[PDB]
Structure formats: structure tokens, C-alpha cells
Amino acid sequence: CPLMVKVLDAVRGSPAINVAVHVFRKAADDTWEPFASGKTSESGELHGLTTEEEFVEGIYKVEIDTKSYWKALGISPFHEHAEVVFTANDSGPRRYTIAALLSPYSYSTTAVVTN
Amino acid sequence: CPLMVKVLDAVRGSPAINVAVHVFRKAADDTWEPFASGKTSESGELHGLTTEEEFVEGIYKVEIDTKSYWKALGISPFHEHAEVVFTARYTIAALLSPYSYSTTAVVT
Amino acid sequence: CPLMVKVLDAVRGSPAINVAVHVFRKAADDTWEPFASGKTSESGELHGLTTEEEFVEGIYKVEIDTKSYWKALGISPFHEHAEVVFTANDSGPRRYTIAALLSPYSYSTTAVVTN
Amino acid sequence: CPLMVKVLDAVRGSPAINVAVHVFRKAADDTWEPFASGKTSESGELHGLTTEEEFVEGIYKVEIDTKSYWKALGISPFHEHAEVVFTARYTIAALLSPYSYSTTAVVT
Ligand SMILES: O=C(O)c1ccc(-c2cc(F)cc(F)c2)cc1
Ligand SMILES: O=C(O)c1ccc(-c2cc(F)cc(F)c2)cc1
């Protein structure tokens, strides 16, 4: 249950559906290694990215493919993607929700971290 | 200027121009009385609302007519307007989308 | 299920718990009439404000008592409250989620409206 | 100026001052090469990053070191930094909180 991504659309007032998300974890040599990926559901949520055992301490990047999302609607957006980079699990296991709110020339993101 | 409003459009990536803004001060009977108003400029800014002399401590409401703004672009928006209510340099900034806005105060 | 409010805290990375919310509906004479109220739960959600039958077409104001929230933490915030004013159900019944993200000198809000 | 960055602090309601900002351009082999950098001023602004001559079409990354900013205020923040990636007047604005940020592009 440890990592979840939620994406909303501020233009349509809806979940952002079928948004591709890629998660990377920084490796020893400081390269970004592929960690997990998926697509948001009809409710704009992405679950089952990882397990408690696999989501170890480290620096993670969640890249939300906002450009493919807007291009799929028809709209030539500003950003290539929205990145969320963070250290995770560095004082033990936490549950992380990464939420993003998308517009063609703006996005926000926030984290909810619980124990 | 003691009070400035700045309005940006999050969809087009542009200042939000010609947006109506009305400011009210809270009266003793808890009603809102008109204080100042204007339209945003080509840079999405509204200055000249008040002077330091008039802008005393009080509760103020800044109402931004986001609904007319979006309608004129052909978009049905969600909010009737965007209201920012605070007690009192103040900059009230607003970033608009059809179903969302944000607002921040830069008090310098 | 027709009206829900979700509030997050951007300072703590947590749901905003025990935030008071008052909902008003504009009356014939253009006064704001009390409609519903409650407090956000431990997950920062507020459900059971109204029923499909009672939530008729109209203009509604959802006032989120952000100042009492921050004052309860210790922080003297900028805003008195966050207001969300909107016309509801004017092309039939919709389900409305009103979400807000709070910081002492800033908030955002977004609507998710589904059918 | 073709490119300006502006950074605001959503908690204190202030410009975010002395924030490090680094800009990278995407190279042909898909790597990020350094382009320009600076610290935000007392108004939370960074100008002088580039000239029109140098700022050609390309994919750019603006990295804002939000983590050092928050740490210096005694706050453990969530993000390592805030990255804004786009293809190319550009203003990149960022509004910061410890567990949240937003960003917008005002292209005028
Ligand atoms: O919370 C937001 O979405 C947000 C709100 C306002 C701004 C912003 C505020 C300013 F005063 C100037 C600017 F360029 C951008 C940037 C982001
Ligand atoms: O800063 C914002 O605009 C913003 C970003 C995300 C959310 C949000 C996050 C969630 F996990 C759920 C929700 F309903 C809304 C609400 C507002």
C-alpha cells in the first residue's frame, strides 16, 4: 500500500485518466534507475506500484507524463512532464500519496505521508 | 501601493487581463461595504485600489470575477468567482483554471 | 453521496483534520442561507453533508475555516477562511468533490464533478 | 529577458530569497547540460540567466533547490527540489510549501 499517485484535471474538473507515470530510484552511481510504472485509472489513481519490501530507503522520482496527457486531448501543453523528487523511508516505512493537479501551463503537487 | 492584485491564467500561461476585481471592508454590523474596484491590466495587475491612509486594519474581501473571464473565452467554469478574505505592502495573487484556483498573499 | 469536501495540509504533508466547514445556499432574496456543516475526519474528508433530494439546483458557498485550523496549531494564518462558491446541479444532479490544499499564506481549491 | 524565474514562499507569504536555481538544456545524447544558474534576489526573482541569442529552441530543465531553502528555516521538507521541464518571454513561477509546490509559466 506504500506508494500511490492521484492526478486531477483542473480544466475539466475530473480525474486525469490514463496518465502514464514512471517512478525511478537513484542508484549507487547516482543514475536514475527504473523502479515502477503504470497508468492512472478512471478515478485518476495509480495503486500497486510497489510493495513494502521493495520500496526501500532511497531518493525517488515520480514522473507524470503530463504532455502525453494533454496531447491526447488535443492541447499543446507547456511542460514536458511533472516530476516529484523525494527521499523516502529514511526514518522507517511511510505510506506516500503523491497528488498532482494539472492545467496546460501549470501544475501543482503535494505529498501526504502517513504512518 | 498598500494593496495590489495580480491574476494569472493557468490554462493559457498568460496574465488574466480585464478581470473584474471588487474589494469590500467588513462593517461594524458584519456586512460587507464597498471599498475599491478595478479591472486587471494587460499584465494581469490591478494597482491604485487604495492609499495607505485609507487602508486601515480591518477584514477585507477581494472578489475576483473569474466566471466572466472564462465565459468570454468560451469555457464554462466552475466557480462563480474567487474570494480572498483576510485581516489587515499586500499583494494578493490568484492563479486561475476553469475548475481550480489558487491564491497567495505576498506581504512585504 | 452528492457533496464531499477534502482538505490537505501542505505544511505537514497530512490530511487537515477537524477543519470546520460550513455550506450556505443563496436564497430567493439573495441572502446566504445555512445549508450544512461539519468537521473533516482523520483522513481530512467530510461526507454526509446532504442528500440527493435536499441538494437542489442553486448557488452554494463552502466556507472552510482555515483560520481556526491554523490557530489551533499555533500559527497566525493570512486568510480568514477559504470560500468556494459555485452553481450546482444546473444541468441535473452531479456529484461534487471540493478539495482544498492549505498553507498559512496560500490555499488552492479544485472541484471534481462527476455523473 | 527571455527567461525569468520567480519563487514565492506560501507559508511565510514572502518572496523566497537566496534560493538556488539551475537551468539545463537537453543535449543530443539525451543528457542535461548546464545552461545557467543563480540565486533568487530579495524579491524572489532571478533575471539575467540568458540572452535571446543563446536561448534557442530546445528542452530545458529549471531546478529549484527548495530543500536547502526549507532546511535553513528549520523545516524538514518533502522534495529534494522542484524541477520544471519544458520545450522552448518566459516566466517560470514557483510557489513553495514544505510538502507541496505549484509552478506556472507566463509566456508573454
Ligand atoms: O498557488 C499557485 O498555484 C500559484 C499562485 C500564484 C503564483 C504567482 C504569484 C505571483 F505573485 C507572481 C507569479 F508570477 C506567480 C504562482 C503559483
Ligand atoms: O494544490 C492543489 O491545487 C491541489 C492538489 C491536489 C489536491 C488533491 C489531492 C488528493 F489526494 C485528493 C484530492 F481530492 C485533491 C487538491 C489540491
DSSP 8-state symbol, B92: E
Q: How far is the CA of D23 from the centre of ligand 2 (A)?
A: 28
C-alpha to C-alpha distance for D10 and D97, rounded to whole angstroms: 6
Three-state secondary structure call for residue B72? helix
Terminal alpha carbon distance of chain D: 11
Q: What is the DSSP string of chain A?
A: --EEEEEEETTTTEE-TT-EEEEEEE-TTS-EEEEEEEE--TTSEE--S--TTT--SEEEEEEE-HHHHHHTTT---SEEEEEEEEEESBTB--EEEEEEEEETTEEEEEEEEE-
C-alpha to C-alpha distance for C15 and B98, rounded to whole angstroms: 25
Tell how strand B79-87 and strand C79-88 pair up. Answer: antiparallel
- The amino acid occupying position A82 is A
C-alpha to C-alpha distance for B90 and B1, rounded to whole angstroms: 8
C108 annotated to bind ligand: yes
Burial code (b: 16+ CB inside 10 Å, e: under 16) for D49-81 equals bbeeeebeeeebbbbbbbbebbeeeeeebbbbb
Reference D6, options A7, B91, B23; nearest CA is B91
Structure-solving method? X-ray
What are the chain D neighbours of C11 within 8 Å (beta carbons)? 11, 97-99
CA D22 centroid distance within chain: 7
Which neighbouring-strand residues pair with D36? D23
* Domains: count for chain B: 1
Are the beta carbons of D78 and A111 closer than 8 angstroms?
A: yes
Domain CATH code at residue B68: 2.60.40.180
Nearest CA to ligand 1 atom 17: D95
The torsion angles phi and psi of C56, rounded to 5 degrees, stand at: -80, 180
Mutate to test the interface with A, among B75, B99, B101 (most CBs of A within 10 A): B99
C-alpha to C-alpha distance for A73 and A102, rounded to whole angstroms: 13
Q: Quick check: CB of C97 below 6 Å from ligand 2? A: yes
C-alpha cell at C95: 456529484
Cell 445556499 locates to C25
Q: Which atom of ligand 1 is nearest to the CA of D91?
A: 14
Are the beta carbons of B72 and C73 closer than 8 angstroms?
A: no
| DSSP3 helix / strand / coil % (chain B, rounded to 5) | 5, 55, 40
C-alpha cell at C16: 487537515
Reference A84, options D66, D5, B8; nearest CA is D66
Q: What is the DSSP string of C12-27?
A: TTEE-TT-EEEEEEE-
Burial code (b: 16+ CB inside 10 Å, e: under 16) for B66-97 equals bbebbeeeeeebbbbbbbbbbeeebbbbbbbb
Tell how strand A106-114 and strand D100-107 pair up. Answer: antiparallel
Are the beta carbons of A95 and A115 closer than 8 angstroms?
A: yes
CA C6 centroid distance within chain: 7
Nearest CA to ligand 2 atom 13: C99
Are the beta carbons of B24 and B35 closer than 8 angstroms?
A: yes
Are the beta carbons of A105 and B11 closer than 8 angstroms?
A: yes
Reference D96, options D12, D4, D3; nearest CA is D12
CA D28 centroid distance within chain: 23
C-alpha to C-alpha distance for A36 and C71, rounded to whole angstroms: 40
- The amino acid occupying position B74 is G
- The amino acid occupying position A21 is V
Which neighbouring-strand residues pair with B58? none
Q: What is the DSSP string of D40-95?
A: --TTSEE--S--TTT--SSEEEEEE-HHHHHHHTT---SEEEEEEEEE--EEEEEE
Reference D11, options A85, C69, B92, C9; nearest CA is C9
B6 annotated to bind ligand: yes
C-alpha to C-alpha distance for D89 and A54, rounded to whole angstroms: 44
Nearest to C79 among B78, B86, B97 (CB): B86
Distances D1 to B41, C32, D43, D53 between C-alpha atoms, Å = 21, 48, 17, 11
> Domain of B71?
1-108
Tell how strand B59-64 and strand B20-26 pair up. Answer: antiparallel
C-alpha to C-alpha distance for A22 and A14, rounded to whole angstroms: 21
Nearest to B98 among A10, A78, A101 (CB): A10
Are the beta carbons of B19 and B69 closer than 8 angstroms?
A: yes
Are the beta carbons of C104 and C78 closer than 8 angstroms?
A: yes
Reference B13, options A79, D58, C1; nearest CA is A79
State the sign of the Cα–Cα–Cα–Cα dihedral A62, A67, A68, A69: positive
Ramachandran sector of residue D74 (left: φ over 0; alpha: ψ -120 to 50; beta: rest) = left
**How many other C-beta atoms are found inside a 10 Å radius of the C-beta of residue D89?**
10
Tell how strand B32-39 and strand B20-26 pair up. Answer: antiparallel
Q: Which residue of A has its CA nearest to B98?
A: A11
DSSP H or E segment with residue C1: none
Q: Which residue of D has its CA nearest to A78?
A: D86
Cell 456529484 locates to C95
Burial environment of residue B14 by CB neighbours within 10 A (0 to 12, 13 to 18, 19 or more): middle
Alpha helices in chain C (DSSP H): 66-71
C-alpha cell at B52: 495607505
Mutate to test the interface with B, among A14, A105, A109 (most CBs of B within 10 A): A105
Resolution in A: 1.5
The torsion angles phi and psi of C29, rounded to 5 degrees, stand at: -85, 10
C-alpha cell at A8: 486531477
Mutate to test the interface with A, among C84, C110, C113, C115 (most CBs of A within 10 A): C110
- The amino acid occupying position C25 is R
C-alpha cell at B24: 469590500
Q: Do B13 and A108 touch (CB under 8 A)?
A: no
Burial code (b: 16+ CB inside 10 Å, e: under 16) for C2-41 equals bbbbbbbbbbbbbbbbebbbbbbbbeeeeebeebbeeebe
C89/chain A closest Cα distance in angstroms: 14
Are the beta carbons of D21 and D65 closer than 8 angstroms?
A: yes
Nearest CA to ligand 2 atom 14: C99
Among B90, B102, B106, B108, name the best residue to mutate to test ligand 1's pocket (greatest count of ligand atoms within 8 A of Cβ). Answer: B102
Are the beta carbons of D103 and D82 closer than 8 angstroms?
A: yes
What are the chain B neighbours of C113 within 8 Å (beta carbons)? 78, 99
What are the chain C neighbours of A8 within 8 Å (beta carbons)? 99, 110, 112
C-alpha to C-alpha distance for B10 and A9, rounded to whole angstroms: 12
What are the chain C neighbours of D102 within 8 Å (beta carbons)? 108
DSSP 8-state symbol, B17: T
